[PDB]
Amino acid sequence: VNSFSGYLKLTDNVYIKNADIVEEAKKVKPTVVVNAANVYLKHGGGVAGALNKATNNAMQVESDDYIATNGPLKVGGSCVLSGHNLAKHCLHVVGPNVNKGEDIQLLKSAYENFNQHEVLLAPLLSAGIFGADPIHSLRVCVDTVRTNVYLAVFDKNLYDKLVSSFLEMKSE
Ligand SMILES: Nc1ncnc2c1ncn2[C@@H]1O[C@H](COP(=O)(O)OP(=O)(O)OC[C@H]2O[C@@H](O)[C@H](O)[C@@H]2O)[C@@H](O)[C@H]1O
């Protein structure tokens, strides 16, 4: 498990790779794969749909059951559910939907959830359907997460831009 390979080390604990998170999970067999969720755990586009489809919809059914008994998450909150065939666990984390005006500062709260796990395979929260700047999401990740986070960025152009922008933010 957790056999990550081919990552660029950004900081002592943050790593990045140009890869699809679903194919990484199959290769790596992680203890925790992170889902970029919404508060009702209705898995639409982006990472949530890809993960769910790879579980043959098991993750959506499990999520419906979780909501029925526990109610919705808060923005910036999380829950641990099964990883099914992709990982031991899936950490469903709700970043702010800044397309809908939600507080971008809640992205720190979202990434703080990573600190409850030794090692995680993760995407950049809020940077897709939720419309946050991917560079900003990476900055919050680097400044917030103290545990080992392996980030999967599937788009090669975005990967290159993120590395490049990281170098500027780091050299000040
Ligand atoms: N298969 C993938 N592999 C790696 N990265 C991916 C993949 N799919 C998307 N990404 C990237 O991961 C980042 C996160 O984007 P989203 O998955 O859209 O997550 P988010 O912006 O937080 O929006 C969450 C919302 O989208 C719905 O899927 C979900 O149900 C929730 O309502 C983006 O940079 C996005 O381009």
Q: Which atom of ligand 1 is nearest the CA belonging to 94?
A: 22
Q: Order of strands, edge to edge, in the sheet holding 8-9?
A: 8-9, 14-18, 148-153, 119-122, 32-37, 89-94, 78-82
Does residue 1 form part of some domain? no
List residues bridging with 18 in a β-sheet. 153
Cα atoms in the 13 Å half-sphere on the side-chain side of 78 = 26
CATH code of the domain covering residue 96:
3.40.220.10
Q: Are 47 and 124 in contact (CB under 8 A)?
A: no
Q: How far is the CA of 128 from the centre of ligand 1 (A)?
A: 5
**Resolution of the structure, angstroms:** 2.0
Q: How far is the CA of 151 from the centre of ligand 1 (A)?
A: 12
Does residue 49 form part of some domain? yes
Distance CA 34, CA 121 (A): 6
Q: How far is the CA of 93 from the centre of ligand 1 (A)?
A: 11
Distance CA 143, CA 146 (A): 8
Ligand 1, residues at Cβ distance < 6 Å: 20-22, 36-38, 42-50, 95, 123-130, 134, 152-154
Does residue 52 form part of some domain? yes
Q: Are strands 89-94 and 8-9 parallel, antiparallel or unpaired?
A: unpaired
Amino acid at 134: P
Q: Are 16 and 153 in contact (CB under 8 A)?
A: yes
Three-class secondary structure assignment of the chain: CCCCCCCEECCCCEEEEECCHHHHHHHHCCCEEEEEECCCCCCCCHHHHHHHHHCCCHHHHHHHHHHHHHCCCCCCCEEEEECCCCCCEEEEEECCCHHHCCCCCHHHHHHHHHHHCCEEEECCCCCCCCCCCHHHHHHHHHHHCCCEEEEEECCHHHHHHHHHHHHHHHHC
Q: Are 107 and 141 in contact (CB under 8 A)?
A: no
Listed residue (150, 130, 142) closest to 32, CA to CA: 150
Print the domain residue range for 12: 8-171
Q: Token pair for residue 149?
A: 């986070």
Q: Token pair for residue 110?
A: 């979202």
Which whole-number Å values give the CA distances from 94 to 32, 35, 121, in the listed order? 16, 8, 16
Count of domains forming the chain: 1
- The number of residues in the chain equals 172
115-134 residues labelled b (16+ CB within 10 A) or e (exposed): eebebbbbbbbbbbebebeb
List residues bridging with 33 in a β-sheet. 90, 121
Distance CA 169, CA 172 (A): 5
Q: How far is the CA of 122 from the centre of ligand 1 (A)?
A: 10
Q: Are strands 14-18 and 148-153 parallel, antiparallel or unpaired?
A: parallel
C-alpha angle 164/126/160, rounded to 5°?
A: 20
Q: How far is the CA of 46 from the centre of ligand 1 (A)?
A: 4
For a mutational test of ligand 1's pocket, the pick from 23, 24, 43, 47, i.e. the residue with the most ligand atoms closer than 8 A to its C-beta, is: 47
Distance CA 22, CA 24 (A): 5
Q: Whose CA is nearest to atom 30 of ligand 1?
A: 43
Distance CA 123, CA 61 (A): 22
Does residue 36 form part of some domain? yes
Does residue 2 form part of some domain? no
